[PDB]
Write a protein that holds these residues in place. Structure first.
Motif, PDB file in Angstrom:
ATOM      1  N   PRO A  57      -5.940   7.172 -20.935  1.00  0.00           N
ATOM      2  CA  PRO A  57      -7.322   7.506 -20.604  1.00  0.00           C
ATOM      3  C   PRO A  57      -7.471   8.586 -19.557  1.00  0.00           C
ATOM      4  N   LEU A  58      -6.390   8.919 -18.854  1.00  0.00           N
ATOM      5  CA  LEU A  58      -6.430   9.900 -17.775  1.00  0.00           C
ATOM      6  C   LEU A  58      -5.488  11.087 -17.992  1.00  0.00           C
ATOM      7  N   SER A  59      -6.079  12.265 -18.104  1.00  0.00           N
ATOM      8  CA  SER A  59      -5.332  13.507 -18.171  1.00  0.00           C
ATOM      9  C   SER A  59      -5.801  14.308 -16.966  1.00  0.00           C
ATOM     10  N   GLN A  64     -13.614  19.049   2.111  1.00  0.00           N
ATOM     11  CA  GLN A  64     -14.387  18.104   1.295  1.00  0.00           C
ATOM     12  C   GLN A  64     -15.668  18.681   0.650  1.00  0.00           C
ATOM     13  N   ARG A  65     -15.703  18.689  -0.684  1.00  0.00           N
ATOM     14  CA  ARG A  65     -16.895  19.083  -1.450  1.00  0.00           C
ATOM     15  C   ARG A  65     -17.878  17.916  -1.523  1.00  0.00           C
ATOM     16  N   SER A  66     -17.412  16.790  -2.056  1.00  0.00           N
ATOM     17  CA  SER A  66     -18.144  15.529  -2.101  1.00  0.00           C
ATOM     18  C   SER A  66     -17.224  14.392  -1.702  1.00  0.00           C
ATOM     19  N   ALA A  67     -17.821  13.322  -1.200  1.00  0.00           N
ATOM     20  CA  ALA A  67     -17.083  12.150  -0.749  1.00  0.00           C
ATOM     21  C   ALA A  67     -17.262  11.011  -1.736  1.00  0.00           C
ATOM     22  N   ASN A  68     -16.234  10.186  -1.884  1.00  0.00           N
ATOM     23  CA  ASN A  68     -16.309   9.033  -2.774  1.00  0.00           C
ATOM     24  C   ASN A  68     -15.976   7.762  -2.013  1.00  0.00           C
ATOM     25  N   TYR A  69     -16.428   6.632  -2.549  1.00  0.00           N
ATOM     26  CA  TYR A  69     -16.198   5.329  -1.942  1.00  0.00           C
ATOM     27  C   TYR A  69     -14.748   4.917  -2.120  1.00  0.00           C
ATOM     28  N   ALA A  96     -20.370   3.341  -9.514  1.00  0.00           N
ATOM     29  CA  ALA A  96     -20.751   4.278 -10.582  1.00  0.00           C
ATOM     30  C   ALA A  96     -19.545   5.075 -11.080  1.00  0.00           C
ATOM     31  N   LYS A  97     -18.772   5.582 -10.130  1.00  0.00           N
ATOM     32  CA  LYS A  97     -17.418   6.021 -10.375  1.00  0.00           C
ATOM     33  C   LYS A  97     -16.541   4.986  -9.687  1.00  0.00           C
ATOM     34  N   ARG A  98     -15.440   4.603 -10.336  1.00  0.00           N
ATOM     35  CA  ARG A  98     -14.539   3.568  -9.803  1.00  0.00           C
ATOM     36  C   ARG A  98     -14.152   3.769  -8.332  1.00  0.00           C
ATOM     37  N   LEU A 138      -3.205  20.885  -3.487  1.00  0.00           N
ATOM     38  CA  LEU A 138      -4.291  20.763  -4.437  1.00  0.00           C
ATOM     39  C   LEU A 138      -4.261  19.333  -4.946  1.00  0.00           C
ATOM     40  N   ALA A 139      -5.182  18.502  -4.469  1.00  0.00           N
ATOM     41  CA  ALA A 139      -5.195  17.116  -4.902  1.00  0.00           C
ATOM     42  C   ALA A 139      -6.225  16.937  -6.022  1.00  0.00           C
ATOM     43  N   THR A 140      -5.765  17.150  -7.244  1.00  0.00           N
ATOM     44  CA  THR A 140      -6.654  17.261  -8.377  1.00  0.00           C
ATOM     45  C   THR A 140      -7.129  15.933  -8.912  1.00  0.00           C
ATOM     46  N   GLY A 141      -8.104  16.009  -9.811  1.00  0.00           N
ATOM     47  CA  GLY A 141      -8.662  14.829 -10.453  1.00  0.00           C
ATOM     48  C   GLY A 141      -8.255  14.680 -11.901  1.00  0.00           C
ATOM     49  N   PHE A 142      -9.087  13.987 -12.669  1.00  0.00           N
ATOM     50  CA  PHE A 142      -8.725  13.629 -14.027  1.00  0.00           C
ATOM     51  C   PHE A 142      -9.776  13.997 -15.055  1.00  0.00           C
ATOM     52  N   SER A 150     -11.601  -0.104 -22.463  1.00  0.00           N
ATOM     53  CA  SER A 150     -10.883   1.037 -21.927  1.00  0.00           C
ATOM     54  C   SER A 150     -10.544   0.906 -20.425  1.00  0.00           C
ATOM     55  N   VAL A 151     -10.900   1.917 -19.648  1.00  0.00           N
ATOM     56  CA  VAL A 151     -10.547   1.916 -18.243  1.00  0.00           C
ATOM     57  C   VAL A 151     -11.299   0.842 -17.464  1.00  0.00           C
ATOM     58  N   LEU A 152     -12.216   0.144 -18.133  1.00  0.00           N
ATOM     59  CA  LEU A 152     -13.024  -0.875 -17.480  1.00  0.00           C
ATOM     60  C   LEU A 152     -12.334  -2.239 -17.457  1.00  0.00           C
ATOM     61  N   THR A 186      -6.835  23.010 -12.915  1.00  0.00           N
ATOM     62  CA  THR A 186      -6.589  23.624 -11.609  1.00  0.00           C
ATOM     63  C   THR A 186      -7.710  24.637 -11.359  1.00  0.00           C
ATOM     64  N   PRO A 187      -8.420  24.478 -10.228  1.00  0.00           N
ATOM     65  CA  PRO A 187      -9.551  25.363  -9.937  1.00  0.00           C
ATOM     66  C   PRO A 187      -9.113  26.777  -9.543  1.00  0.00           C
ATOM     67  N   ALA A 188      -9.616  27.766 -10.271  1.00  0.00           N
ATOM     68  CA  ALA A 188      -9.386  29.164  -9.935  1.00  0.00           C
ATOM     69  C   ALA A 188      -9.836  29.437  -8.495  1.00  0.00           C
ATOM     70  N   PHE A 189      -8.894  29.760  -7.622  1.00  0.00           N
ATOM     71  CA  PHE A 189      -9.260  30.210  -6.290  1.00  0.00           C
ATOM     72  C   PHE A 189      -8.871  31.668  -6.187  1.00  0.00           C
ATOM     73  N   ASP A 190      -9.825  32.528  -5.850  1.00  0.00           N
ATOM     74  CA  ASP A 190      -9.518  33.942  -5.765  1.00  0.00           C
ATOM     75  C   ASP A 190      -8.439  34.143  -4.723  1.00  0.00           C
ATOM     76  N   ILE A 196      -7.237  20.151  -0.589  1.00  0.00           N
ATOM     77  CA  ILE A 196      -8.450  20.396  -1.352  1.00  0.00           C
ATOM     78  C   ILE A 196      -8.567  19.305  -2.423  1.00  0.00           C
ATOM     79  N   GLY A 197      -9.638  18.521  -2.328  1.00  0.00           N
ATOM     80  CA  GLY A 197      -9.872  17.391  -3.226  1.00  0.00           C
ATOM     81  C   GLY A 197      -9.777  16.073  -2.492  1.00  0.00           C
ATOM     82  N   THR A 198     -10.714  15.165  -2.750  1.00  0.00           N
ATOM     83  CA  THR A 198     -10.678  13.842  -2.130  1.00  0.00           C
ATOM     84  C   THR A 198     -10.922  12.715  -3.156  1.00  0.00           C
ATOM     85  N   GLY A 199     -10.283  12.833  -4.321  1.00  0.00           N
ATOM     86  CA  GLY A 199     -10.245  11.749  -5.301  1.00  0.00           C
ATOM     87  C   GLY A 199      -9.152  10.757  -4.934  1.00  0.00           C
TER      88      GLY A 199
HETATM   89  N1  LIG Z   1      -7.715   2.324 -12.463  1.00  0.00           N
HETATM   90  C1  LIG Z   1      -8.359   3.226 -13.207  1.00  0.00           C
HETATM   91  O1  LIG Z   1      -8.514   3.012 -14.402  1.00  0.00           O
HETATM   92  C2  LIG Z   1      -8.890   4.494 -12.556  1.00  0.00           C
HETATM   93  C3  LIG Z   1      -8.380   4.913 -11.314  1.00  0.00           C
HETATM   94  C4  LIG Z   1      -8.878   6.072 -10.718  1.00  0.00           C
HETATM   95  C5  LIG Z   1      -9.877   6.792 -11.384  1.00  0.00           C
HETATM   96  N2  LIG Z   1     -10.377   6.391 -12.581  1.00  0.00           N
HETATM   97  C6  LIG Z   1     -11.429   7.183 -13.263  1.00  0.00           C
HETATM   98  O2  LIG Z   1     -11.045   8.567 -13.385  1.00  0.00           O
HETATM   99  C7  LIG Z   1     -12.028   9.466 -12.835  1.00  0.00           C
HETATM  100  C8  LIG Z   1     -11.420  10.562 -11.929  1.00  0.00           C
HETATM  101  O3  LIG Z   1     -10.808  10.094 -10.703  1.00  0.00           O
HETATM  102  P1  LIG Z   1     -10.566  11.022  -9.379  1.00  0.00           P
HETATM  103  O4  LIG Z   1     -11.466  10.522  -8.271  1.00  0.00           O
HETATM  104  O5  LIG Z   1      -9.089  11.101  -9.073  1.00  0.00           O
HETATM  105  O6  LIG Z   1     -11.045  12.506  -9.838  1.00  0.00           O
HETATM  106  P2  LIG Z   1     -12.231  13.375  -9.142  1.00  0.00           P
HETATM  107  O7  LIG Z   1     -13.440  12.479  -8.955  1.00  0.00           O
HETATM  108  O8  LIG Z   1     -12.393  14.668  -9.924  1.00  0.00           O
HETATM  109  O9  LIG Z   1     -11.638  13.695  -7.670  1.00  0.00           O
HETATM  110  C9  LIG Z   1     -11.138  14.988  -7.303  1.00  0.00           C
HETATM  111  C10 LIG Z   1     -11.763  15.485  -5.998  1.00  0.00           C
HETATM  112  O10 LIG Z   1     -11.537  16.897  -5.912  1.00  0.00           O
HETATM  113  C11 LIG Z   1     -12.785  17.550  -5.677  1.00  0.00           C
HETATM  114  N3  LIG Z   1     -12.880  18.897  -6.289  1.00  0.00           N
HETATM  115  C12 LIG Z   1     -12.912  19.201  -7.605  1.00  0.00           C
HETATM  116  N4  LIG Z   1     -13.017  20.546  -7.781  1.00  0.00           N
HETATM  117  C13 LIG Z   1     -13.057  21.126  -6.556  1.00  0.00           C
HETATM  118  C14 LIG Z   1     -13.164  22.512  -6.004  1.00  0.00           C
HETATM  119  N5  LIG Z   1     -13.253  23.596  -6.817  1.00  0.00           N
HETATM  120  N6  LIG Z   1     -13.172  22.657  -4.650  1.00  0.00           N
HETATM  121  C15 LIG Z   1     -13.085  21.595  -3.816  1.00  0.00           C
HETATM  122  N7  LIG Z   1     -12.985  20.315  -4.238  1.00  0.00           N
HETATM  123  C16 LIG Z   1     -12.967  20.024  -5.572  1.00  0.00           C
HETATM  124  C17 LIG Z   1     -13.855  16.622  -6.235  1.00  0.00           C
HETATM  125  O11 LIG Z   1     -15.129  16.830  -5.621  1.00  0.00           O
HETATM  126  P3  LIG Z   1     -16.267  17.696  -6.370  1.00  0.00           P
HETATM  127  O12 LIG Z   1     -16.232  17.129  -7.775  1.00  0.00           O
HETATM  128  O13 LIG Z   1     -17.532  17.381  -5.614  1.00  0.00           O
HETATM  129  O14 LIG Z   1     -15.855  19.149  -6.226  1.00  0.00           O
HETATM  130  C18 LIG Z   1     -13.278  15.255  -5.937  1.00  0.00           C
HETATM  131  O15 LIG Z   1     -13.704  14.803  -4.640  1.00  0.00           O
HETATM  132  C19 LIG Z   1     -13.082   8.598 -12.148  1.00  0.00           C
HETATM  133  O16 LIG Z   1     -14.399   8.985 -12.563  1.00  0.00           O
HETATM  134  C20 LIG Z   1     -12.763   7.151 -12.518  1.00  0.00           C
HETATM  135  O17 LIG Z   1     -13.785   6.576 -13.345  1.00  0.00           O
HETATM  136  C21 LIG Z   1      -9.901   5.265 -13.166  1.00  0.00           C
END
Ligand SMILES: NC(=O)c1ccc[n+]([C@@H]2O[C@H](COP(=O)([O-])OP(=O)(O)OC[C@H]3O[C@@H](n4cnc5c(N)ncnc54)[C@H](OP(=O)(O)O)[C@@H]3O)[C@@H](O)[C@H]2O)c1
Ligand SMILES: Cc1cc2nc3c(=O)[nH]c(=O)nc-3n(C[C@H](O)[C@H](O)[C@H](O)COP(=O)(O)OP(=O)(O)OC[C@H]3O[C@@H](n4cnc5c(N)ncnc54)[C@H](O)[C@@H]3O)c2cc1C
Length: 523
Positions: free
Chosen positions: A138-140, A202-207, A321-323, A371-375, A427-429, A144-148, A178-181
């Motif tokens: 469920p997670l890919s 930090q762009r946005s903060a999460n719980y 709302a987001k995990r 670069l601490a990326t998301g999914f 799924s992930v729920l 990677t964000p283009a940074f000039d 960069i990134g706080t997921g």
């Molecule tokens: N156990 C499980 O099944 C499980 C566990 C973890 C997560 N999940 C699911 O997977 C999803 C993703 O998780 P995640 O929190 O690791 O990913 P994420 O929410 O994308 O976290 C990445 C962080 O990087 C930041 N970011 C992204 N682009 C940026 C940029 N250009 N400049 C600066 N900061 C940037 C984001 O903030 P901005 O978006 O504000 O830029 C965010 O704070 C969640 O929605 C959740 O539902 C499931």
């Protein structure tokens, strides 16, 4: 070059698939793009990475011996532990021989006359399968964000998605994250303990919730292992796939005192389960406000500087709302003299130069950028596969207006095709080891059913998918997980929201009934 089942992926789901299909006498061939077994746990190996479901729950129940024989070292296992465990599974059950590693599945094309799937890889393989089982997770990675001018930075650029196998020394370095997921929150405190200085952008903060990670008491380790059977029975019948009942009464119906107690008690459990303390917590927005509130207090308690604690508070979002991320001393980390939080809203990143990061406001001399990326989207992996069903229709085309399935395990046009823990299912729920066990078992029974009756294949019906689509829409409308800015969305909420135990009931009674909703094919 021809097999009974072709499996895509070798993480929790794929590995169990190999085992389960083989015991039934099916011949399996599995493909893995990675170099070793483990899936997410193999490739996602940044410092501090761990699961958020208790490891006693988040593990296989199919093998009573493994269950007894394996000792988890702590409450939430870290990735190198979970990795060691899955490699042990592969060891114990001789799984690797039927996996081809370093091989990425590119296309899969249905032969309609024969009800077979020709599968092709980037390493030139071409195999024929009776059944295609995709277990690609469920997670890919998010992009990677283009940074000039990233290409101009003279120091080190480390990606949490591709962490060096032999570690990175932060000793004496000036580090920018960069990134706080999860990736960020999980690694930050570790980076912070040895870095010279750490800036967190930090762009946005999460719980996030305190893990409250205790190593298990010896006397309890055997007492739990004796009560495993009853612990598994509960989780299977449960809603999240863990042995945890939510509160009987509603959030607001019970007194202010008695709520601060339950909220505290579930706070000990941590992260995922905390969002399921009160029944209406992810339903009634007034009830969710009470959680946001309990959470905000805890953070101001632990962070010294109000200005910072305010910046660390997720602004105007719903909690759960987001995990919720689970961390180990993340907020505490900000009380240190060598960590600074930068508000990207106040001073965004405009690019990088030779010596560090450029925000509108200042320049940051840095030696290392993490670069601490998301999914990416729940589908994600499947998008990169080319799956050609009936009529030469593509799965991407079929899902053009959002994913459509029956139970998640059927799609018209796609006979003998099974996608593992994705759209249409909890799924992930839910706990995903158990969810993988359920789905593999279900597929295995289906194949057995066919094999019995002498039948060529199974295929979701137009009528059945539309009902399931309708049903998924209806379980979701209420949820605060159904935001506009929610990860769970396509174009359409993707998971089935009714609960694991209930979902298990449904697909089980569907099998028992002779697969009502599916067509059985003779071919
Ligand atoms: N156990 C499980 O099944 C499980 C566990 C973890 C997560 N999940 C699911 O997977 C999803 C993703 O998780 P995640 O929190 O690791 O990913 P994420 O929410 O994308 O976290 C990445 C962080 O990087 C930041 N970011 C992204 N682009 C940026 C940029 N250009 N400049 C600066 N900061 C940037 C984001 O903030 P901005 O978006 O504000 O830029 C965010 O704070 C969640 O929605 C959740 O539902 C499931
Ligand atoms: C930090 C973190 C903590 C988590 N904690 C929990 C938890 O506590 N509880 C929980 O239930 N879930 C958790 N998850 C969710 C996790 O994603 C799943 O639990 C787990 O990954 C599911 O295993 P899987 O085999 O279904 O998929 P994956 O582990 O994602 O494995 C899929 C595999 O298939 C391979 N693959 C994909 N496409 C192709 C292709 N075209 N060709 C070849 N191979 C391919 C991938 O390479 C990958 O190896 C967590 C995730 C993260 C990132």
């Amino acid at each position: 070059t021809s097999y009974d089942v072709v499996v895509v992926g070798a993480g929790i789901a794929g590995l169990y698939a190999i085992h389960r299909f083989r015991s039934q006498g099916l011949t399996v061939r599995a493909f893995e793009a990675a170099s070793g077994v483990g899936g997410v746990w193999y490739w996602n190996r940044y410092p501090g990475a761990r699961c958020d479901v208790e490891s006693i729950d988040y593990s296989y129940s199919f093998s009573p011996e493994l269950e007894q024989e394996w000792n988890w070292s702590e409450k939430y296992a870290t990735q190198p532990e979970i990795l060691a465990y899955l490699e042990h599974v592969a060891d114990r059950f001789d799984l690797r021989r039927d996996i081809r590693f370093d091989t990425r599945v590119t296309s899969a094309v249905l032969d309609e006359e024969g009800l077979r799937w020709t599968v092709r890889t980037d390493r030139g393989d071409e195999v024929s399968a009776r059944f295609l089982v995709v277990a690609a997770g469920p997670l890919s990675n998010a992009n990677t964000p283009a940074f000039d001018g990233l290409d101009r930075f003279t120091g080190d650029i480390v990606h949490t998605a591709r962490w060096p196998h032999d570690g990175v020394d932060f000793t004496g370095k000036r580090v920018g994250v960069i990134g706080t997921g999860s990736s960020g929150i999980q690694s930050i405190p570790i980076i912070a303990e040895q870095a010279e200085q750490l800036f967190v952008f930090q762009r946005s903060a999460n719980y996030s919730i305190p893990a409250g990670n205790v190593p298990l008491d010896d006397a309890t380790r055997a007492e739990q292992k004796a009560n495993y059977a009853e612990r598994r029975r509960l989780s299977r019948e449960s809603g999240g796939g863990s042995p945890h009942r939510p509160h009987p009464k509603s959030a607001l119906e019970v007194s202010e005192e008695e709520r601060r107690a339950v909220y505290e008690e579930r706070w000990k459990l941590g992260g995922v389960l905390f969002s399921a303390a009160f029944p209406d917590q992810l339903t009634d927005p007034a009830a969710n406000d009470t959680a946001r509130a309990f959470w905000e207090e805890k953070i101001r308690a632990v962070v010294d500087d109000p200005a910072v604690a305010e910046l660390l508070t997720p602004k105007d979002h719903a909690i759960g709302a987001k995990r919720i991320v689970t961390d180990s001393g993340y907020y505490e980390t900000y009380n240190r003299d060598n960590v600074e939080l930068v508000d990207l809203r106040s001073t965004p990143i405009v690019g990088m130069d030779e010596t560090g990061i450029v925000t509108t406001g200042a320049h940051y001399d840095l030696d290392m950028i993490v670069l601490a990326t998301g999914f990416d989207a729940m589908t994600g992996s499947l998008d990169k596969l080319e799956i050609v069903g009936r009529g030469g229709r593509t799965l991407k085309e079929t899902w053009a207006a959002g994913p459509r399935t029956y139970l998640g395990l059927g799609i018209d046009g796609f006979p003998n095709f099974f996608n593992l823990t994705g759209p249409g299912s909890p799924s992930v729920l839910a706990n995903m080891v158990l969810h993988s066990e359920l789905h593999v078992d279900w597929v295995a029974d289906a194949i057995a059913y066919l094999d019995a009756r002498g039948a060529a294949g199974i295929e979701g019906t137009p009528e059945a998918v539309a009902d399931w689509v309708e049903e998924c829409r209806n379980r979701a409308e209420a949820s605060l997980l159904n935001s506009a800015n929610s990860w769970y969305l396509g174009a359409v909420f993707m998971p089935f929201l009714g609960g694991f135990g209930v979902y298990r009931e449904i697909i089980t009674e569907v099998a028992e009934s002779g697969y009502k909703g599916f067509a059985i094919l003779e071919g």
